[PDB]
C-alpha cells in the first residue's frame, strides 16, 4: 500500500509549502502601494484600423522594431502589417487555416504559426530570392498548438494541448527539451526578458515557472478557479500576470512565490482572453469576452480605462517594445492601434 | 516618396488577392464530422467520395469541406469555438455498439458526447445531421441480444423497426433547443448510396434559412 503512503506524504508536503508561503506574506501589495497617487482616467483613441482579414483574428505579435506586426486569422492567411502606414508588407497563405497562435522573431527574419494541425511552421521572411516560403515544420506535439515564442533565430519554445511544452531547434527540427508537469492543456506562455526562464498557464488553473536550460519546473503558482487563458511577464522579470476564465486577473511574484494582487470587478463576468503590460509595468491591459479591452493599475488594482472599439470578442493584445501603442485584434476581423 | 508610393500599390495588389480568395472561400460549405472513433466515420468519408483531417468532395456544383477532429484527444471546450459557423454538423453513431463497453457501454458514451455538442453554446442554430451506421450488424445482433442491455427502461419487441426507432428518439430527446435547431436522422448501411444526397438536402435547408436571414423574411 505504498500508493496511499506516497499520497499521504504529498498532502503533508503540500501543507508545508502553504505554511511557508503564508509566513512570507508579511503584508499585501494593496497595503504597500496605498500611499502612491493613482494614475487617473486613461483615454485611448484608435489611431489606426487595419482591414483585410475576412475571419476571426486569433493572434498577433509586434515586431521588435515597434513598427511591424503580424496577425493570424482563420481564413488561412498570415498578414504582416506596417503599423505606421497601415500598408501590408506580406500576406502568407498557410497550409492549415486552423491557426491559433502567431510569433515574430526578435531578429525579424522569421515568423511562426500553429494551431489544430499540431505543427508549428517557421516562415522565412528574408527570402534572398523570391517571396516568403516555409522553412521548418516542427512536428512532434500531440495536441493543438496554443502558443509559440522565439528565443532567437534558431530556438523556439511552444506549448500544446497535450499538457506539455517543448523546446525546439529550427536547424534540426527536434525537441531539445520537453517540459512536463501540467495536468491540463497549456493555453499560453511568456518568455522572461532574460530569455532564461518562462511561465506557462494551463487549463488546470496552475501556472508553472520553467527553466529553459535545465528543463524542469521550479515554482508552481495556484489561486485561480478556472482555466488560465493568458500569461505575461512583468517588465522587471520578477513577476507575471495571469488571465483566467473566471473574469479575474492575478499578479504573482517569482521571489515571494505567492499571489500579490487580484484584478476583479463585479461588473465583469466575462473571462479574460489576453493580458499585456505597459512598458513601465504600471498598467495591466486585459482583453475580455464582453468586447472591450480593460486597463488596470497594477499597483492599486483599480480600473483606469476602457478600450471599447470592437464589435466581437477581443482575442489578442499587444504592446510595442517602444511602448507608444497598443494593438488590439478581435473576432470581428479588425486590428486597432490605440494612442 | 517614390519608394513610398510604390509600396502602397503593393498593398493594393495584396488587397485584391485577399478578396479573390475570400470570395472563393465563401462559396464553400464547411461541415464538422464527429463520432466515437469506431462509430463508422471512416465508412462515411468513403461514402461522400495527426491533427485535423480535411476532406474535399463536391455534389451538384457545390463544394464541401469536412473536418474530422477525432484525433485531437484534448479538451474539446478550448478549440470548439473555431468551428462556430459551419453549415452543419455530421454526427456518426454506430448502432452495433449498444451492448459493447469501452464499465460503461459505448452507446451511452456517444449520447454523452452528442448531448454536449448538441447543447453547446457555440452551436445553438447549426443543424445536426445524425448518421446511425452499422444498421446491418445491428439488425443481426438484436436477434441474439436484447436492447435492454443498453437501456434498462426499454419495453418492446426485439425487432429491427421497433428497436432502431427507439434508439433514434432517445438521441433526439437530448436536444433541449427544440425550437431553434433541427436534427436530421438517417439510418446508414455500410454499403449503401444516397448518403451524400441526404447531406446535400440538409445543407440546402441551412442555406435557405441563411439566405432568408439576409433578406429579413426569417
Amino acid at each position, epitope marked *: 500500500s505504498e500508493l496511499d503512503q506516497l499520497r499521504q506524504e504529498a498532502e503533508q508536503l503540500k501543507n508545508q509549502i502553504r505554511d511557508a508561503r503564508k509566513a512570507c506574506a508579511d503584508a499585501t501589495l494593496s497595503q504597500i502601494t496605498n500611499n502612491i497617487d493613482p494614475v487617473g482616467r486613461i483615454q485611448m483613441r484608435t489611431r489606426r484600423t487595419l482591414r483585410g482579414h475576412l475571419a476571426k483574428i486569433y493572434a498577433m505579435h509586434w515586431g521588435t522594431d515597434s*513598427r*511591424l506586426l503580424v496577425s493570424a486569422s482563420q481564413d488561412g492567411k498570415l498578414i504582416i502589417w*506596417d503599423s505606421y502606414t497601415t*500598408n501590408k*508588407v*506580406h500576406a502568407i497563405p498557410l497550409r492549415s487555416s486552423w491557426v491559433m497562435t502567431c510569433a515574430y522573431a526578435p531578429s525579424g527574419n522569421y515568423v511562426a504559426c500553429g494551431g489544430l494541425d499540431n505543427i508549428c511552421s517557421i516562415y522565412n521572411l528574408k527570402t*534572398r*530570392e*523570391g*517571396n516568403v516560403r516555409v522553412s521548418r515544420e516542427l512536428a512532434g506535439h500531440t495536441g493543438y498548438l496554443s502558443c509559440c515564442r522565439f528565443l532567437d533565430d534558431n530556438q523556439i519554445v511552444t506549448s500544446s494541448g497535450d499538457t506539455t511544452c517543448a523546446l525546439w531547434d529550427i536547424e534540426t527540427g527536434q525537441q531539445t527539451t520537453t517540459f512536463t508537469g501540467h495536468t491540463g492543456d497549456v493555453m499560453s506562455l511568456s518568455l522572461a526578458p532574460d530569455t532564461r526562464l518562462f511561465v506557462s498557464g494551463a487549463c488546470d488553473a496552475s501556472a508553472k515557472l520553467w527553466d529553459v536550460r535545465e528543463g524542469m519546473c521550479r515554482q508552481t503558482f495556484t489561486g485561480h478557479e478556472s482555466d488560465i487563458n493568458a500569461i505575461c511577464f512583468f517588465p522587471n522579470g520578477n513577476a507575471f500576470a495571469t488571465g483566467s476564465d473566471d473574469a479575474t486577473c492575478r499578479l504573482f511574484d517569482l521571489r515571494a512565490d505567492q499571489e500579490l494582487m487580484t484584478y476583479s470587478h463585479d461588473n465583469i463576468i466575462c473571462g479574460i482572453t489576453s493580458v499585456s503590460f505597459s512598458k513601465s509595468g504600471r498598467l495591466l491591459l486585459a482583453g475580455y469576452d464582453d468586447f472591450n479591452c480593460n486597463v488596470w493599475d497594477a499597483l492599486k488594482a483599480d480600473r483606469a480605462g476602457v478600450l471599447a472599439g470592437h464589435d466581437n470578442r477581443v482575442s489578442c493584445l499587444g504592446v510595442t517594445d517602444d511602448g507608444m501603442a497598443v494593438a488590439t485584434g478581435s473576432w470581428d476581423s479588425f486590428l486597432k492601434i490605440w494612442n | *516618396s*517614390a*519608394e*513610398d508610393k*510604390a*509600396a502602397v*500599390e*503593393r498593398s493594393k*495588389m495584396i488587397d485584391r488577392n485577399l478578396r479573390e480568395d475570400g470570395e472563393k472561400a465563401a462559396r464553400e460549405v464547411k461541415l464538422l464530422l464527429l463520432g466515437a472513433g469506431e462509430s463508422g466515420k471512416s465508412t462515411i468519408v468513403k461514402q461522400m467520395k495527426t491533427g485535423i483531417v480535411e476532406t474535399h468532395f463536391t455534389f451538384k456544383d457545390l463544394h464541401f469541406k469536412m473536418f474530422d477532429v477525432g484525433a485531437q484527444r484534448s479538451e474539446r471546450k478550448k478549440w470548439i469555438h473555431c468551428f462556430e459557423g459551419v453549415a452543419a454538423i455530421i454526427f456518426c453513431v454506430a448502432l452495433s455498439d449498444y451492448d459493447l463497453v469501452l464499465e460503461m457501454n459505448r452507446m451511452h458514451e456517444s449520447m454523452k458526447l452528442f448531448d454536449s455538442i448538441c447543447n453547446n453554446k457555440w452551436f445553438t442554430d447549426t443543424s445536426i445531421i445524425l448518421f446511425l451506421n452499422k444498421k446491418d450488424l445491428f439488425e443481426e445482433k438484436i436477434k441474439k441480444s436484447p436492447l435492454t442491455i443498453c437501456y434498462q427502461e426499454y419495453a418492446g419487441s426485439n425487432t429491427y423497426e421497433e428497436a432502431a426507432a427507439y434508439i433514434q428518439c432517445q438521441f433526439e430527446d437530448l436536444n433541449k433547443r427544440k425550437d431553434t435547431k433541427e436534427i436530421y436522422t438517417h439510418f446508414t448501411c455500410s454499403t449503401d448510396t444516397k448518403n451524400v444526397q441526404f447531406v446535400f438536402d440538409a445543407v440546402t435547408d441551412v442555406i435557405i434559412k441563411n439566405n432568408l436571414k439576409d433578406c429579413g423574411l426569417f
Partner: single-chain antibody
Amino acid sequence: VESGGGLVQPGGSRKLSCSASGFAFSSFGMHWVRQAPEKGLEWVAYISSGSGTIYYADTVKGRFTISRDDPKNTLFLQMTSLRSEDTAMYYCVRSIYYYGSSPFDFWGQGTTLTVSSDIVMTQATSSVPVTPGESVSISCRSSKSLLHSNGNTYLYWFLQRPGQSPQLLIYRMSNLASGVPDRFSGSGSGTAFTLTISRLEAEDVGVYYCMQHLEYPLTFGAGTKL
C-alpha cells in the same frame, strides 16, 4: 539570373527581351538602366509589379515602350526610333518595394546594340590612387536634399567591377546590401554623402555609381573609378 537582348541595326527598330529565372518574377518591378560605351549609367524606363505605374526617361518618353509578361517570366522593351545617341549596353534591373526591401538588388548581364526639373548628382572626383590596404572615401553631392519626411534618404551606391554588371553595395543612406562585406560604410547629411571603404582588396577596384530615388526621373553620378 536574367539575360537576353538584341544586336546591331542601322538606324531602325529593335525589341529587347529579358528572361527571368527563379526569383518570383511576378512580384518584382523591373527597370532598364542602360550604360553608354564609355559614359556612366543612365535610367531608361520602369514597369511596376502587375503592370501598373509605368515611367520613361525624358529622352525616350515617346519612342520606347516597356512591357512585361508575368507568364513565361519575360520582360520586353520596344525601341522604335533608334538614333545615334542611344547606342549603349542595356541592363535589366529587378527591384521590389516594401517597408524593408532593397531595390536594385540584382542586375542583369546586359547586352549591347549599336546603330553606326531633374536632380543632378555631381560626384566631382573621378580618379583616386589604386594602392591597396588603405581607407579610401568616395564623396557625392546632390542638387537637392534627399532626406524625405519619412526620414530616410534615398541614395543608393553601386559598384561596377570592370567586366561585369553593377552590384548594389548600400541601399538608402547607410543600409548595407546582402552579401556585401562590412568594409563598406555610408554616411550622409541629406545633400552630401560619402562612401567609406575600410580596407581595399583586389576585387574592390572599379567604378562606383551613386543614384537617387526621391523623384522618379532618377539619375546616376557618372562614377568614380579607382
